[PDB]
Tab-separated table of C-alpha atoms (C1' of nucleotides) in Angstrom:
chain	number	residue	atom	x	y	z
A	1	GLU	CA	0.000	0.000	0.000
A	2	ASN	CA	2.996	2.374	-0.011
A	3	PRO	CA	5.976	1.594	-2.318
A	4	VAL	CA	6.742	5.088	-3.581
A	5	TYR	CA	10.098	5.858	-1.813
A	6	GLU	CA	10.128	9.522	-0.911
A	7	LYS	CA	13.622	11.019	-0.679
A	8	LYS	CA	15.291	13.068	2.075
A	9	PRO	CA	15.683	16.876	1.740
A	10	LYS	CA	19.386	15.901	1.588
A	11	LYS	CA	21.162	19.263	1.332
A	12	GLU	CA	22.496	19.819	4.897
A	13	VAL	CA	26.228	20.334	4.034
A	14	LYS	CA	28.776	22.490	2.241
A	15	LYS	CA	31.990	20.633	3.195
A	16	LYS	CA	34.775	19.428	0.878
A	17	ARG	CA	38.262	18.146	1.530
A	18	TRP	CA	39.159	14.602	2.625
A	19	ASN	CA	41.981	13.254	0.424
A	20	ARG	CA	45.139	14.654	-1.133
A	21	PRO	CA	45.203	16.295	-4.557
A	22	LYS	CA	47.593	15.159	-7.252
A	23	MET	CA	50.755	17.209	-6.735
A	24	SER	CA	51.908	19.376	-9.598
A	25	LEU	CA	54.717	18.757	-12.067
A	26	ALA	CA	56.907	21.561	-10.752
A	27	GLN	CA	56.329	20.437	-7.164
A	28	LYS	CA	57.506	16.904	-7.922
A	29	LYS	CA	60.360	18.175	-10.102
A	30	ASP	CA	61.756	20.367	-7.324
A	31	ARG	CA	61.334	17.486	-4.880
A	32	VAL	CA	63.920	15.582	-6.927
A	33	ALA	CA	66.649	18.225	-6.706
A	34	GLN	CA	65.772	18.720	-3.036
A	35	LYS	CA	66.661	15.027	-2.653
A	36	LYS	CA	69.756	15.316	-4.863
A	37	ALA	CA	71.058	18.205	-2.770
A	38	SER	CA	70.353	16.318	0.472
A	39	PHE	CA	72.450	13.327	-0.606
A	40	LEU	CA	75.552	15.314	-1.514
A	41	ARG	CA	75.788	17.048	1.864
A	42	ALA	CA	75.759	13.602	3.492
A	43	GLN	CA	78.958	12.686	1.623
A	44	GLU	CA	80.688	16.072	1.488
A	45	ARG	CA	80.536	17.103	5.135
A	46	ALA	CA	79.807	13.794	6.894
A	47	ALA	CA	82.698	11.846	5.353
A	48	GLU	CA	85.340	14.596	5.697
A	49	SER	CA	84.884	15.827	9.283
B	1	C	C1'	41.073	80.251	-97.973
B	2	C	C1'	44.331	78.012	-101.633
B	3	C	C1'	45.532	75.604	-106.481
B	4	U	C1'	44.179	74.951	-111.745
B	5	G	C1'	33.718	73.641	-114.841
B	6	G	C1'	37.663	70.970	-111.406
B	7	G	C1'	40.903	69.981	-107.048
B	8	G	C1'	42.592	70.786	-101.975
B	9	G	C1'	41.731	72.460	-96.623
B	10	G	C1'	39.576	75.286	-92.208
B	11	G	C1'	35.185	75.516	-89.931
B	12	C	C1'	29.780	76.599	-88.336
B	13	C	C1'	26.718	75.541	-81.613
B	14	G	C1'	25.098	74.245	-77.381
B	15	G	C1'	26.334	70.240	-73.363
B	16	G	C1'	28.842	67.491	-69.801
B	17	C	C1'	32.955	64.247	-68.337
B	18	C	C1'	37.366	59.280	-67.495
B	19	A	C1'	39.731	63.841	-66.688
B	20	C	C1'	43.634	68.928	-67.607
B	21	C	C1'	46.210	73.725	-62.122
B	22	C	C1'	43.767	75.806	-56.382
B	23	C	C1'	39.820	74.390	-51.810
B	24	U	C1'	36.156	68.958	-50.277
B	25	C	C1'	33.884	63.506	-48.882
B	26	C	C1'	33.826	57.921	-48.740
B	27	C	C1'	35.984	53.016	-49.440
B	28	A	C1'	40.320	49.703	-50.411
B	29	C	C1'	45.489	48.533	-49.610
B	30	G	C1'	50.264	49.483	-47.445
B	31	G	C1'	53.509	51.852	-43.373
B	32	C	C1'	54.622	54.760	-38.809
B	33	G	C1'	52.791	56.256	-34.136
B	34	C	C1'	47.818	55.663	-30.348
B	35	G	C1'	43.757	54.490	-27.087
B	36	A	C1'	40.869	50.864	-25.063
B	37	C	C1'	39.517	45.092	-25.079
B	38	C	C1'	40.839	40.069	-25.179
B	39	G	C1'	44.779	36.089	-25.175
B	40	C	C1'	49.682	34.187	-23.729
B	41	U	C1'	53.464	34.711	-20.285
B	42	C	C1'	57.909	36.007	-18.176
B	43	U	C1'	62.480	39.124	-20.957
B	44	C	C1'	64.681	44.141	-19.558
B	45	C	C1'	64.243	43.132	-13.749
B	46	C	C1'	65.968	42.028	-8.660
B	47	A	C1'	68.166	40.132	-4.066
B	48	G	C1'	80.246	38.507	-13.214
B	49	G	C1'	77.983	34.337	-11.203
B	50	G	C1'	72.871	33.820	-7.504
B	51	G	C1'	67.477	34.471	-7.719
B	52	G	C1'	61.937	35.681	-10.030
B	53	C	C1'	57.249	38.712	-12.172
B	54	G	C1'	57.475	40.697	-7.722
B	55	G	C1'	54.048	42.296	-2.864
B	56	G	C1'	50.865	41.202	0.967
B	57	G	C1'	47.412	38.421	3.254
B	58	C	C1'	42.155	35.140	3.560
B	59	G	C1'	44.892	30.930	3.368
B	60	G	C1'	45.512	25.881	2.143
B	61	A	C1'	48.030	21.580	0.480
B	62	C	C1'	52.738	19.929	0.527
B	63	U	C1'	58.318	18.905	-0.110
B	64	G	C1'	63.759	17.117	2.356
B	65	U	C1'	69.963	9.387	3.247
B	66	C	C1'	66.582	14.852	7.270
B	67	C	C1'	71.175	22.748	5.756
B	68	C	C1'	64.524	22.132	10.672
B	69	C	C1'	65.284	25.066	8.496
B	70	A	C1'	65.123	26.153	3.686
B	71	G	C1'	62.009	25.142	-0.617
B	72	U	C1'	57.278	24.140	-4.400
B	73	G	C1'	52.320	24.519	-6.322
B	74	C	C1'	47.178	26.165	-6.050
B	75	G	C1'	42.447	29.511	-5.215
B	76	C	C1'	41.098	34.518	-4.324
B	77	C	C1'	41.862	40.341	-3.696
B	78	C	C1'	44.907	44.267	-5.815
B	79	C	C1'	49.375	46.799	-8.895
B	80	G	C1'	53.701	45.927	-12.691
RNA sequence: CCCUGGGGGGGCCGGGCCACCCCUCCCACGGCGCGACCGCUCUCCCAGGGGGCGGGGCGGACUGUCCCCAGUGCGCCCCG
């Protein structure tokens, strides 16, 4: 006698961020040289002193 | 009018113009400057080589055999 399935008013939010965005090309390119610089100080100063 | 019935020339009078020298419109095409709009972006620029569009925040998300202090994007607001 009642199959019609009314729906909730459902609005109730304006909230959005839960997972990371895809990091940019220049951000992952400068991460590489920030690793390359951090390896060479480990051999320059920490094998000489 | 000329030359010997005949021969050789000039014309007749009004109009405009592709146009002929001086003042005036519109289109097309080219060049040199100009204003404003839209689009792309960092050069002169700045702290010989060094760093760049810089400048701030509302800010946020990050990055690193760990200079934990330095470094990279993004959205907005506003100038170059």
